[PDB]
Design a protein around this ligand. Sequence first.
Ligand code: SF4
Ligand code: CA
Ligand code: CA
Length: 222
Amino acid sequence: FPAREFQRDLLDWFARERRDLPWRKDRDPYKVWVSEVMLQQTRYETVIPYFEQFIDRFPTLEALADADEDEVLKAWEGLGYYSRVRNLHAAVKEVKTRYGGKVPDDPDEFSRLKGVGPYTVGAVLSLAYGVPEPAVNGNVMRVLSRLFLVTDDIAKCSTRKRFEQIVREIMAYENPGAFNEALIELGALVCTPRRPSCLLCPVQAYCQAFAEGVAEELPVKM
DNA sequence: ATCCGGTGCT
DNA sequence: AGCACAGGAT
Ligand code: SF4
Ligand SMILES: [Ca+2]
Ligand SMILES: [Ca+2]
């Protein structure tokens, strides 16, 4: 697989099209982490006002940790999934007491926190710290299942481990953050659930599902 | 190594 | 009412 050329074409694309969303203003692990929790449940158009107001109320991780839960829940009002923000609250309290207020940059450590799974680990540590971990969410599973014609149930751990391995193989290690972002952005903008925009896709030349005319049938879920 | 749940949509 | 989504789940 021509990894170097693929990276070129994907990142050249991403440099052109990258959206300057609010959570892309800096590489604060705390802000990145908050945006990822919000975006796991809710579309980005809705997330935009909530994120800006949440951070305004809680500018730092210690600010969040120090807040009463009632305050946290009120800030979350409208997003739903209240138990997810309670878990976020718990996790940042642990970060403050145990990790001196700094989001741990070791994957195994960060993963030990309540609510923090493989995607959240990879997304935060690669976007904020440049740690070359995969950040495989639904978008990325869709993109990769198409590029490499993966027909296995994406609900399975074995399928997700295969996606991770693919990423570790093809990742641009000179910038794992931009690489992971670009895969996610591709799935947001171009390689969409229905009717992906293959005629405008920067990595069309590499895509097995397009070559086989079966993009719309991917990913497989059961 | 999952399979669960809160949510939106219909 | 049933269904799809989307990640973490221990
Ligand atoms: S060519 Fe079509 S299916 Fe293949 S990656 Fe690009 S958008 Fe997705
Ligand atoms: Ca974990
Ligand atoms: Ca099974």
